[PDB]
Amino acid sequence: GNKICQFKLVLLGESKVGKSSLVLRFVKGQFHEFQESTIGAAFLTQTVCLDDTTVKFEIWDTAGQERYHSLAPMYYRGAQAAIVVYDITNEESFARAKNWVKELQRQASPNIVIALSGNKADLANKRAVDFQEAQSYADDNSLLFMETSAKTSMNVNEIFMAIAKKLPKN
């Protein structure tokens, strides 16, 4: 196909859940076991093939530490999509993700597509957040949910592609 679309996407979530790892896996096909905490935000782009459309993603990978919370609006303000990420081995991170979801639903664009990533799914032997519970939460709040693993690549390309498919392309 010859159609070309571009969308702004932002990732939000508690520090250490794997936001930078998810983006690097999607964008560069890389995974760094020793990835350092982000300062403020990092920016990356990736283009994918979606049927007859070439979709370019402008991605804002925000720093999750609470001291950067006040900068969040700068990154999600004009976002057409967001991925709120939590760590399936950390219930605290899951609760924090729900609060990010609430903030987006109240302050970001009203038509924003919000996906929920239950990351570090490769660490299921240390699971603290039930898959079905997370699925129910996501269903009740109209969020696109998938458990993912930046480490193995499980559902990484899939969650970004699922978002691309749901964004307006006429």
Task: Report the nearest approach of Mg ion to the CB of residue 54 (Å).
Answer: 27
Task: Using DSSP, state whether 78 is helix, strand or coil.
Answer: coil
- Residues forming contacts to Mg ion in the complex (CB under 5 A) are 19-20, 38
Q: Is 117 in the site for ligand GNP (CB under 6 A)?
A: no
Residue 122 binds ligand GNP, judged by CB under 6 A: yes
**C-alpha to C-alpha distance for 162 and 150, rounded to whole angstroms:** 16
Do the beta carbons of residue 21 and residue 29 sit within 8 Å? Answer: no
State the Cα angle at 97 between 63 and 41, rounded to 5°: 15
Among Mg ion, ligand GNP, none, residue 16 binds (CB under 5-8 Å by kind): ligand GNP
CB 27 within 8 A of CB 77: no
CA 68-161-35 angle, 5° bins:
40
Cα–Cα distance, 20 to 63 (Å, whole number): 9
Q: Mask: binding to ligand GNP, 44-83, rule CB under 6 A, as x and -?
A: -------------------xxx------------------
> Smallest distance, Å, CB 69 to ligand GNP?
11
Q: Phi first, then psi: what are they for 115, rounded to 5°?
A: -110, 150
Shortest spacing between CB 155 and Mg ion, in angstroms = 19
- Nearer residue to Mg ion within complex by CB, 64 or 137: 64
The residue among 12 and 113 lying less far from ligand GNP, judged by its C-beta, is 12
- Per-residue contact flags (x/-) with ligand GNP for residues 7 to 46, judged by CB under 6 A: ------x-xxxxxxx----------xxxx-xx--------
Identify any residues that bridge with 47 across adjacent strands, giving them in sequence order.
56
Would you state the structure tokens that stand for residue 14, as one six-digit string? 């508690």
Which residues in this chain contact ligand GNP in the complex, by CB under 6 A? Answer: 13, 15-21, 32-35, 37-38, 63-65, 119-120, 122-123, 149-151
